Amino acid sequence: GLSDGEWQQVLNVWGKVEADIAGHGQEVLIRLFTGHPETLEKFDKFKHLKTEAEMKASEDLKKHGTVVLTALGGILKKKGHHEAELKPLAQSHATKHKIPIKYLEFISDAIIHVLHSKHPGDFGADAQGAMTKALELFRNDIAAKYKELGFQ
Numbered sequence: 101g102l103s104d105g106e107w108q109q110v111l112n113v114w115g116k117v118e119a120d121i122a123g124h125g126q127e128v129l130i131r132l133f134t135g136h137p138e139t140l141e142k143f144d145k146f147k148h149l150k151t152e153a154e155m156k157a158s159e160d161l162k163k164h165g166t167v168v169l170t171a172l173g174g175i176l177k178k179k180g181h182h183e184a185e186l187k188p189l190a191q192s193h194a195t196k197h198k199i200p201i202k203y204l205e206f207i208s209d210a211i212i213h214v215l216h217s218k219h220p221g222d223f224g225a226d227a228q229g230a231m232t233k234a235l236e237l238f239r240n241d242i243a244a245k246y247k248e249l250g251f252q
C-alpha cells in the first residue's frame with residue numbers, strides 16, 4: 101500500500117527508465133544473470149551465454165529486457181490496481197516458466213542496483229523507498245497467486 105506521494109515518486113523514477121527502456125532492461129537482466137547464475141538456467145534462449153561480453157552483445161537479451169520492463173511499467177502505472185495485468189504474469193511464471201518467488205526478489209533488488217548505477221546521485225532516498233515499496237507490492241501480489249496455485 102502506497103500513498104499518492106509515493107506513487108508520484110515511483111512514476112517520476114520510471115520516467116528515467118522510459119527514456120532508455122532497452123538499456124535499462126539489458127542491464128537489469130545482466131545484473132540478475134551475473135549475480136545469480138542459476139537464474140540463467142530458466143531461460144532456454146539465454147543459457148548459451150557464458151560471458152558477460154556475450155550477454156552485452158546479445159540483441160535478443162536487450163529485446164527481452166524491453167518486454168520485461170514494458171510489462172512492469174504497465175503494472176506500475178496502475179498504482180496498485182493491477183489485478184488484471186498481474187494475473188497472467190503470475191500464472192505464466194508459476195506454471196510455465198517455474199520461477200520461484202526468490203528470483204522475483206533477486207530481480208527487484210537488481211532494479212534498485214541498476215537505477216543507482218545509471219543515475220548516481222539522482223536516485224534519492226525517498227525515491228528508493230517508494231520504488232522498493234512498489235516492487236514489494238508487486239512481489240506480494242504475485243506471492244498470493246503462487247500460494248493459490250501451490251507453487252514453490
Ligand code: HEM
Binds near residue numbers: 140144169172192204
Ligand atoms: C519484474 C519481473 C518480471 C516481469 C515483469 C516479467 C515479465 C515477463 C514477460 C512479459 C514475459 C513474456 C510473456 C510471458 O511468458 O508471460 C516473460 C517471460 C519469461 N520470464 Fe519473466 N518477468 C519477470 C521476472 C522473471 C524472472 C525473475 C525470471 C527468471 C529468473 C523470469 C523468467 C521468464 C522466462 C524464462 C520467460 C520466457 C522467456 C522466453 O523463452 O521467451 N521472469 N517475463
